Design a protein around this ligand. Structure first.
Ligand code: K
Length: 271
């Protein structure tokens, strides 16, 4: 027993759930930014900006806040704002308020005609917690929510988090003697890691090499929690991965437990 397994699951789950609180709340902020923009008649760009700016300022964990509208969708005055502060050649209302370099500036969004953070919500007309991407230097993840104006898609409202935040938080976690933990996106990209920050956002469970690892990639794409045995990459010692879904977005929290250390666990139960 084997109630060893039972107990790692239970913890894996606990964590996954703590990180759900965090991610549920972020999305709530986006859903609220957008339900609001749906209800916004005035359509004063500065007032918007204020809202954005102030939600960033008041939510320190947030990489940035933003709104982005379809051509003229915001206030019909797109050709007016062309090239003014916080816009681009288009004059579309696409203001991104962000801490991207300690400094809390605002700037226009980039590639909103091609990036998930916009296109997925436009295609699905539903909320999204995007896969991690490398946007203009930083690896972040966006919680975006479509602004539906009377059954018609007017654009998005969102907020960002950096992986660098995530990893800071996750690599804290320890278990047993050598055991740790990492998050992973819904397609199994690596979101955090205690000793190889070079993997973050660059490798997904398919690169970790093995074929059982491809199995668990499917469980996590479906938000199913399970476990495997596998050799650590940097050393051949068998470890057990316990992944458990993070409900919003269906990411996965993976707990790494050294196969040994569990035999050591069970031993310490003989008297
Ligand atoms: K582009």
């Amino acid at each position: 027993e084997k109630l060893a397994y039972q107990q790692s699951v239970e913890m894996a789950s606990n964590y996954a759930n703590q990180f759900d609180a965090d991610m549920k709340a972020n999305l709530a902020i986006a859903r609220t930014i957008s339900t609001t923009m749906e209800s916004y008649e005035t359509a004063d760009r500065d007032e918007a900006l204020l809202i954005l700016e102030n939600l960033l300022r008041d939510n320190p964990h947030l990489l940035g806040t933003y709104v982005a509208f379809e051509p003229d969708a915001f206030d019909g005055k797109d050709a007016e704002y062309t090239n003014s502060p916080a816009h681009d050649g288009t004059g579309r209302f696409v203001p991104y308020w962000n801490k991207m370099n300690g400094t809390a500036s605002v700037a226009p969004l980039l590639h909103y005609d091609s990036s998930d953070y916009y296109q997925l919500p436009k295609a699905t007309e539903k909320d999204v917690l995007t896969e991690p991407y490398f946007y203009e230097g930083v690896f972040m993840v966006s919680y975006v929510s479509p602004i539906m104006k009377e059954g018609e898609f007017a654009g998005i409202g969102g907020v960002d988090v950096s992986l660098e935040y995530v990893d800071e938080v996750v690599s804290k976690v320890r278990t047993f003697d050598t055991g740790y933990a990492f998050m992973v996106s819904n397609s199994g990209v690596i979101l955090s890691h205690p000793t190889h920050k070079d993997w973050i956002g660059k490798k997904d469970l398919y690169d970790f090499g093995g074929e059982e690892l491809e199995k668990a990639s499917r469980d996590i794409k479906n938000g199913i929690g399970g476990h495997l045995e596998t050799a650590d990459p940097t050393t051949g010692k068998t470890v057990i991965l316990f992944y458990e879904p993070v409900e919003t977005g269906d990411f996965a929290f993976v707990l790494v437990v050294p196969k040994e250390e569990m035999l050591a666990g069970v031993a310490d139960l003989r008297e």
